[PDB]
């Protein structure tokens, strides 16, 4: 069973799933990839749920829920294996936009109910 240091270290490389409009400059987050490395398969597969606190456009910094993780091809590359993907479209936002470059916290939920801050921006 992975320790807290191994879990946090497995979530050190992440990429944001973004949609950008060059004409208006607006950016929207769809989700977050956690990269698979040579020494993180166990800690990533050990985590199944993710709690996210995001900055909403009008309601501000709020907890948007705790949802099951998704398994998606890393960076959307079919030639890349499936990895932990926090799909922000399945969390509760009231339809409000998640501010892309504002405060965001992601916690990993272990099967024995430990929560570890794994992403902080």
């Amino acid at each position, epitope marked *: 069973i992975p320790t807290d240091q191994e879990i946090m270290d497995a979530h050190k490389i992440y990429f944001a799933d973004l949609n950008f409009n060059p004409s208006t400059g607006n950016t929207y987050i769809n989700g977050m990839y956690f990269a698979p490395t040579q020494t993180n398969k166990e800690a990533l597969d050990y985590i199944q749920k993710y709690r996210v606190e995001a900055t*909403l456009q*009008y*309601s*501000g910094f*709020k907890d948007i829920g705790t949802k099951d993780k998704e398994m998606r091809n890393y960076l959307g590359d079919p030639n890349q294996p499936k990895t932990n993907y926090v799909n922000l*479209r*399945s969390y*509760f*936002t*009231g339809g409000e936009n998640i501010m892309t470059y504002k405060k965001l916290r992601i916690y990993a939920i272990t099967p024995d109910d430990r929560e570890l801050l794994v992403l902080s921006v």
Partner: antibody
């Protein structure tokens, strides 16, 4: 295209129970709160309560705390309201309405309404 | 409970007139953190579901004609129709969402004769 499809008209006897539904389509069902509104014939609107389909959190107008029970099924994207111990006061039109905003800001989409008539 | 008082209950209007109706609250609906008034206006024509007109006291919803305008802050609010039209004949409800949700008794518009 967001659409809220409610159940058909209902008749019920006093002291009985009814369960109405609000079929949601065209949006992510778990990212918006579903509210229910009562309107007696000839009278104004009255808020009953809301359910957050993402976590099944509910908030009620205290007038309807014992009367109404809100539920939501994520798999079918359907919101339900159960009314118990029906009296003549419950004969009204009941609307389901989708609410915009993490905090409730406004109702952007409404159902067509479910008519309830309580009579022996 | 936050109490919603709308006046007048009934308003006889003529086509093309400027029409104003008020909604008053028992407590302030202004949220200090966002500086928004959690008050909305809804229109209901007979036999139809209510439709939103204004939210955040003064933000017009997309698709609502420019003749509808909401104003006010704190406890006194106003819905204005710069040129009342035949299709504007309906009942207009104000609604708060600062603490829980409460609808006003509504203001009905009728054709003057």
């Amino acid at each position: 295209q967001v659409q809220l499809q409610q159940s058909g008209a209902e008749l019920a006897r006093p002291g009985a129970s009814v369960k109405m539904s609000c079929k949601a389509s065209g949006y992510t069902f778990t990212s918006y709160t579903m509210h229910w509104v009562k309107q007696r014939p000839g009278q104004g609107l009255e808020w009953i309560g809301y359910i957050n389909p993402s976590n099944d959190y509910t908030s009620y107008n205290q007038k309807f705390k014992d009367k109404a029970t809100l539920t939501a099924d994520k798999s079918s994207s359907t919101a339900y309201m159960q009314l118990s111990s029906l009296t003549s006061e419950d004969s009204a039109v009941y609307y389901c309405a989708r609410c915009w905003g993490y905090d409730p800001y406004y109702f952007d989409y409404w159902g067509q309404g479910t008519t309830l008539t309580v009579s022996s | 409970d936050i109490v919603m008082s709308q006046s007048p209950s009934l308003l006889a209007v003529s086509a093309g007139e400027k029409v104003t109706m008020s909604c008053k609250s028992s407590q302030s609906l202004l949220n200090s953190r966002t500086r928004k008034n959690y008050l909305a206006w809804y229109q209901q024509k007979p036999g139809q579901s209510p439709k939103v007109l204004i939210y955040w006291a003064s933000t017009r919803e997309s698709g609502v004609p420019d003749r509808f305008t909401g104003s006010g802050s704190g406890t006194d609010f106003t819905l204005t129709i710069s040129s009342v039209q035949a299709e504007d004949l309906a009942v207009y409800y104000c609604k708060q969402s600062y603490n829980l949700l409460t609808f006003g008794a509504g203001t009905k518009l009728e054709l003057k004769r």
